[PDB]
């Protein structure tokens, strides 16, 4: 009949997502273990926590 009817709604779909994490300054000391020079004894393998 004559009148105004509401059917559905519309939303502006979002664009490409954005991920923003803080500056990476701290790092593991992996350079001094994998690129090391001399190792410990076999029966005293180290546990570098």
């Amino acid at each position: 009949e004559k009148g105004i009817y509401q059917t559905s709604n519309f939303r502006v779909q979002p664009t490409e997502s954005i991920v923003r994490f803080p500056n990476i300054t701290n790092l593991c000391p992996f350079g001094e273990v994998f690129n090391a020079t001399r190792f410990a004894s076999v029966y005293a393998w180290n546990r570098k926590r």
Epitope: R38, F39, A40, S41, A44, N46
Partner: nanobody
């Protein structure tokens, strides 16, 4: 000082030299003593290894050439080298716990072994 070394200077081939390696206490003697060399270009070569359990295991071609004596008053080690060669010509170190890496060890003042 917790760990130190003594003796050295110039070593006469064939003769006997009473080298020393003093310290402050026996409680710091875990787990090894060693008198080693780091020659330029040569790989790791260890000439001595005095162990915490009163053991000295050396290369079979060297332990006959080396005399062993351990003290506890000054906690010094007595070791004698004869028929010296130029392959030992380096900053001869007394490294306590040589196999424990370069953090649980002390590097001594050093000396030289030269053949005229």
């Amino acid at each position: 000082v917790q760990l130190v070394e003594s003796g050295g200077g110039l070593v006469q081939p064939g003769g006997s030299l009473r080298l020393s390696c003093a310290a402050s206490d026996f409680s710091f003697y875990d787990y090894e003593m060693s008198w080693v060399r780091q020659a330029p270009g040569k790989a790791l070569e260890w000439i001595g290894s005095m162990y915490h359990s009163g053991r000295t295991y050396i290369n079979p071609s060297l332990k006959s050439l080396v005399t062993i004596s351990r003290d506890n008053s000054k906690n010094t080690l007595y070791l004698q080298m004869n028929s010296l060669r130029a392959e030992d010509t380096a900053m001869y170190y007394c490294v306590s716990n040589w196999a424990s890496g370069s953090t649980g060890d002390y590097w001594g003042q050093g000396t030289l072994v030269t053949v005229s």
